[PDB]
RNA sequence: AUUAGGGUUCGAUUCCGGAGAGGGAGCCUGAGAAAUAGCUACCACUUCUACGGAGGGCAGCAGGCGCGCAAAUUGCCCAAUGUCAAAACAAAACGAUGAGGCAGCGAAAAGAAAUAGAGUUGUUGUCAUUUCAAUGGGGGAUAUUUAAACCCAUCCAAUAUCGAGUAACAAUUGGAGGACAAGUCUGGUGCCAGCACCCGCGGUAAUUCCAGCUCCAAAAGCGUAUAUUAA
């Protein structure tokens, strides 16, 4: 017939269960402005000519 | 004003022709008003005629001003 | 119902939300002076933009006109007394070309870490807000305080404060109260 | 071209007011044709009661069922269709449920590939929807 | 640096006015406590008023409204020097003699006020007050 | 409110003016009312009764029932602001006042502002260590405030006053193809589930769905819907 009604959530239902991983807290407010501040600007000497990537991933398939 | 009509008794209906400002257009358009104005058997005026008019107390439902003058 | 408080908003946001050239500006700004978010650049960028009004209205008018002559000298002893601009520069032209890093320097924030009474901007900042620095003889907690060029020798570490004339602070009068009880 | 007379305020005044009826959003909004329609009768949101469930076909060139539910909504028993969005949502939702209608998004025109639905389903049981499908809350009863 | 002394308590008087219409002397009260620990007592601030302006009697001497200033070591209100302690009780409001000791015991509530006397509407003669 | 300017739009709502007290219409008194916590009648509703009768008008405050997407306490006080009055205050001797004020509730909106700061050593910057001081949230008071309380403000001895290290006192809300700041990442689903304001994504190697990780944006705020202004 048209279609199923049923089949709703199949893959919310399908997915497996990760779990999130515990991580230490991060600095909240302006000591996180000053991380932020610390990686873009003062962790690295900007080289003309190649763009800067902030979540660069590796390689794969 | 000036004298519109004169088929009443004692009574005429003058007209005051002005400018309206419109201030979006920054332009003008013509507007009038009429008064019915209550005559003395002094001054005969005529269809056409211009007239000086004061205000005075209500003489009927509609007079509120009458003649002073004829020009 | 019947209250007459006024209030006021003192900032506004950016028109376009994700522009790269102005995200990085405003992100140097926030870590150079330590601030806490971007509201407090656009309470600044608010501030900048009601004087440069008032000023281009000025400079329409002919140099002799009384609103000219009484607002305008005004504003110029605003610039002055705050420190936004120079003594030097005396002409309405200067206060349109007001940028807001001018302003930036003169929050207490900046000013104390400048003064020395603090070893960095974020150092000033937390110094501040933990009662430690008196203007003229008075606590502020305001990290937003414009200082003035006439009350800035008088910035100092406040007389109650550990660092000034005050007791001790809270590590060391526990640790000495622990010190007593351990007995 | 225009009139351009310094008398002539009256002409355009009147040319204005005739015009700007073929302005369709100006005319939708001084005219009562949009909200006498409306389901909702200008509101943002309107309560009312599942009927059944159904689903709903994407349009060409999309291939889904799109889960939605027949609603008759309390304050003037109008039959409207609302969309149910997120993943699994649907079980959230049973027969003669409360629920909390929207529009969805467009100001009563359709919304992507479902034909001709502009309501979407908000809460459920006077719970969101969204935040039962996070399991933020439970559904009472 | 830290130097431990006993706390000292300054009275400051300011737009000090003598208004013979109700036999007083009206002033603004400033309080300088350097090192005080907390706030200073309405009573221990009359005490020092009384004497620097010489009054007979400490308790005709009304102070109120004091309000601490930020950052501490100072306070500001504002206080009263009445010509005797007759004058006091005779001018001064009703609250302000209830934190000095002498005030009038407080009335009942409003509300059961209120029912006597909507209950008193129904009646005639002699039945109020029964 | 939004706007270079011209404009567009909202104005039930604090002040001024008008109108009304369920619906209508009459009227007495009075300087002033066509009054409604005044009267009379009728129509709608509606309460008590011993059945003969007698009543009621929250679009005042609080609070109910409905209605709805949608809006608080059946609280305290006349201390302030005013009104009325035969009336200053006080003395056996305290005028009323839900007008008003003060608290409760309240992420409508608005202002200020925490969630950390300095180092040591090891591995210019990060990271693992390692100390050092500081401060609120909070808990308290000789007290202050207040009509009385409650909030602020002051203080943690003045002889004599509590307290951060996973500072667990643990920041969220939406996103990461394009518009539009941010992943050729890793698993799971195969035009199904779902996403997607628009263009589009998914039919077995998904930059778009469901997830983990990482990253971006705003931040004690942030999405969504509907109007409206600019665009
Ligand atoms: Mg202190
Ligand atoms: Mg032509
Ligand atoms: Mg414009
Ligand atoms: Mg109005
Ligand atoms: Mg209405
Ligand atoms: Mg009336
Ligand atoms: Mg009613
Ligand atoms: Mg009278
Ligand atoms: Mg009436
Ligand atoms: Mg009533
Ligand atoms: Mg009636
Ligand atoms: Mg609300
Ligand atoms: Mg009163
Ligand atoms: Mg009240
Ligand atoms: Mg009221
Ligand atoms: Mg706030
Ligand atoms: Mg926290
Ligand atoms: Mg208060
Ligand atoms: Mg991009
Ligand atoms: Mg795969
Ligand atoms: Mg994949
Ligand atoms: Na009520
Ligand atoms: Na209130
Ligand atoms: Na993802």
Same mark, same amino acid.
Request: glycine fraction near 6%; include cysteine.
């Given at each position: 017939?048209?279609?199923?009604?049923?089949?709703?959530?199949?893959?919310?239902?399908?997915?497996?269960?990760?779990?999130?991983?515990?991580?230490?807290?991060?600095?909240?407010?302006?000591?996180?402005?000053?991380?932020?501040?610390?990686?873009?600007?003062?962790?690295?000497?900007?080289?003309?000519?190649?763009?800067?990537?902030?979540?660069?991933?590796?390689?794969?398939? | 004003?000036?004298?519109?009509?004169?088929?009443?008794?004692?009574?005429?209906?003058?007209?005051?022709?002005?400018?309206?400002?419109?201030?979006?257009?920054?332009?003008?358009?013509?507007?009038?008003?009429?008064?019915?104005?209550?005559?003395?058997?002094?001054?005969?005026?005529?269809? +056409?005629?211009?007239?000086?008019? +004061?205000?005075?107390?209500?003489?009927?439902?509609?007079?509120?001003?009458?003649?002073?003058?004829?020009? | 119902?019947?209250?007459?408080?006024?209030?006021?908003?003192?900032?506004?946001?950016?028109?376009?939300?994700?522009?790269?050239?102005?995200?990085?500006?405003?992100?140097?700004?926030?870590?150079?002076?330590? *601030?806490?978010?971007?509201?407090?650049?656009?309470?600044?960028?608010?501030?900048?933009?009601?004087?440069? @009004?008032?000023?281009? *209205?000025?400079?329409? *008018?002919?140099?002799?006109?009384?609103?000219?002559?009484?607002?305008?000298?005004?504003?110029?002893? @605003?610039?002055?007394?705050?420190?936004?601009?120079?003594?030097?520069?005396?002409?309405?032209?200067?206060?349109?070309?007001?940028?807001?890093?001018?302003?930036?320097?003169?929050? *207490?924030?900046?000013?104390?870490?400048?003064?020395?009474?603090?070893?960095?901007?974020?150092?000033?900042?937390?110094?501040?807000?933990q009662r430690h620095i008196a203007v003229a003889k008075q606590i502020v907690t305001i990290p937003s305080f414009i200082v003035r060029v006439?009350?800035?020798?008088?910035?100092?570490?406040?007389?109650?404060?550990?660092?000034?004339?005050?007791?001790?602070?809270?590590?060391?009068?526990?640790?000495?109260?622990?010190?007593?009880?351990?007995? | 071209?225009?009139?351009?007379?310094?008398?002539?305020?009256?002409?355009?005044?009147?040319?204005?007011?005739?015009?700007?009826?073929?302005?369709?959003?100006?005319?939708?909004?001084?005219?009562?044709?949009?909200?006498?329609?409306?389901?909702?009768?200008?509101?943002?949101?309107?309560?009312?009661?599942?009927?059944?469930?159904?689903?709903?076909?994407?349009?060409?060139?999309?291939?889904?069922?799109?889960?939605?539910?027949?609603?008759?909504?309390?304050?003037?028993?109008?039959?409207?269709?609302?969309?149910?969005?997120?993943?699994?949502?649907?079980?959230?939702?049973?027969?003669?449920?409360?629920?909390?209608?929207?529009?969805?998004?467009?100001?009563g025109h359709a919304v992507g590939d479902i034909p001709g639905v502009r309501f979407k389903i908000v809460k459920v049981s006077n719970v969101?929807?969204?935040?039962?499908?996070?399991?933020?809350?439970?559904?009472?009863? | 640096? !830290?130097?431990?002394?006993?706390?000292?308590?300054?009275?400051?008087?300011?737009?000090?006015?003598?208004?013979?219409?109700?036999? =007083?002397?009206?002033?603004?009260?400033?309080?300088?406590?350097?090192?005080?620990?907390?706030?200073?007592?309405?009573?221990?601030?009359?005490?020092?008023?009384?004497?620097?302006?010489?009054?007979?009697?400490?308790?005709?001497?009304?102070?109120?409204? !004091?309000?601490?200033? !930020?950052?501490?070591?100072?306070?500001?209100?504002?206080?009263?020097?009445?010509?005797?302690?007759?004058?006091?009780? #005779?001018?001064?409001?009703?609250?302000?003699?209830? =934190?000095?000791?002498?005030?009038?015991? #407080?009335?009942?509530? =409003?509300?059961?006020?209120?029912?006597? #006397?909507? #209950?008193?509407?129904?009646?005639?003669?002699?039945?109020?007050?029964?």
């Amino acid at each position: 017939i048209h279609g199923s009604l049923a089949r709703a959530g199949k893959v919310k239902n399908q997915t497996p269960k990760v779990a999130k991983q515990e991580k230490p807290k991060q600095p909240r407010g302006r000591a996180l402005k000053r991380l932020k501040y610390t990686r873009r600007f003062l962790s690295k000497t900007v080289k003309p000519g190649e763009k800067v990537h902030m979540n660069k991933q590796p390689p794969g398939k | 004003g000036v004298v519109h009509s004169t088929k009443m008794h004692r009574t005429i209906i003058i007209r005051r022709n002005y400018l309206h400002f419109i201030k979006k257009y920054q332009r003008y358009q013509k507007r009038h008003k009429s008064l019915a104005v209550h005559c003395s058997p002094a001054f005969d005026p005529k269809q +056409g005629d211009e007239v000086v008019i +004061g205000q005075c107390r209500p003489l009927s439902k509609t007079i509120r001003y009458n003649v002073l003058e004829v020009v | 119902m019947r209250n007459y408080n006024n209030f006021n908003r003192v900032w506004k946001a950016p028109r376009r939300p994700f522009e790269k050239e102005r995200l990085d500006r405003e992100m140097k700004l926030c870590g150079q002076y330590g *601030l806490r978010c971007k509201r407090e650049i656009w309470r600044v960028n608010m501030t900048l933009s009601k004087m440069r @009004r008032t000023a281009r *209205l000025l400079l329409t *008018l002919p140099e002799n006109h009384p609103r000219r002559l009484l607002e305008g000298s005004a504003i110029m002893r @605003r610039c002055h007394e705050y420190g936004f601009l120079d003594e030097e520069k005396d002409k309405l032209d200067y206060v349109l070309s007001l940028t807001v890093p001018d302003i930036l320097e003169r929050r *207490l924030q900046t000013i104390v870490f400048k003064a020395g009474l603090a070893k960095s901007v974020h150092h000033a900042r937390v110094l501040i807000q933990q009662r430690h620095i008196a203007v003229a003889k008075q606590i502020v907690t305001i990290p937003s305080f414009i200082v003035r060029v006439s009350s800035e020798r008088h910035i100092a570490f406040a007389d109650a404060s550990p660092f000034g004339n005050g007791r001790t602070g809270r590590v060391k009068r526990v640790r000495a109260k622990a010190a007593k009880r351990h007995a | 071209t225009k009139t351009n007379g310094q008398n002539a305020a009256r002409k355009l005044v009147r040319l204005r007011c005739r015009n700007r009826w073929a302005d369709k959003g100006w005319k939708r909004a001084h005219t009562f044709s949009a909200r006498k329609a409306n389901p909702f009768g200008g509101s943002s949101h309107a309560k009312g009661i599942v009927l059944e469930k159904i689903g709903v076909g994407a349009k060409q060139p999309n291939s889904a069922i799109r889960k939605c539910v027949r609603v008759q909504l309390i304050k003037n028993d109008k039959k409207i269709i609302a969309f149910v969005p997120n993943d699994g949502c649907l079980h959230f939702i049973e027969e003669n449920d409360e629920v909390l209608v929207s529009g969805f998004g467009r100001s009563g025109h359709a919304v992507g590939d479902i034909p001709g639905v502009r309501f979407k389903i908000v809460k459920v049981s006077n719970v969101g929807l969204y935040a039962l499908y996070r399991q933020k809350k439970e559904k009472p009863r | 640096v !830290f130097q431990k002394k006993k706390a000292e308590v300054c009275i400051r008087t300011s737009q000090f006015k003598v208004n013979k219409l109700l036999n =007083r002397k009206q002033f603004i009260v400033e309080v300088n406590h350097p090192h005080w620990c907390g706030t200073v007592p309405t009573q221990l601030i009359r005490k020092k008023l009384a004497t620097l302006y010489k009054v007979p009697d400490a308790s005709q001497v009304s102070l109120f409204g !004091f309000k601490t200033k !930020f950052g501490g070591g100072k306070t500001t209100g504002f206080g009263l020097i009445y010509d005797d302690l007759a004058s006091l009780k #005779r001018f001064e409001p009703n609250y302000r003699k209830t =934190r000095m000791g002498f005030g009038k015991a #407080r009335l009942p509530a =409003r509300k059961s006020v209120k029912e006597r #006397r909507n #209950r008193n509407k129904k009646l005639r003669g002699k039945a109020k007050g029964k």
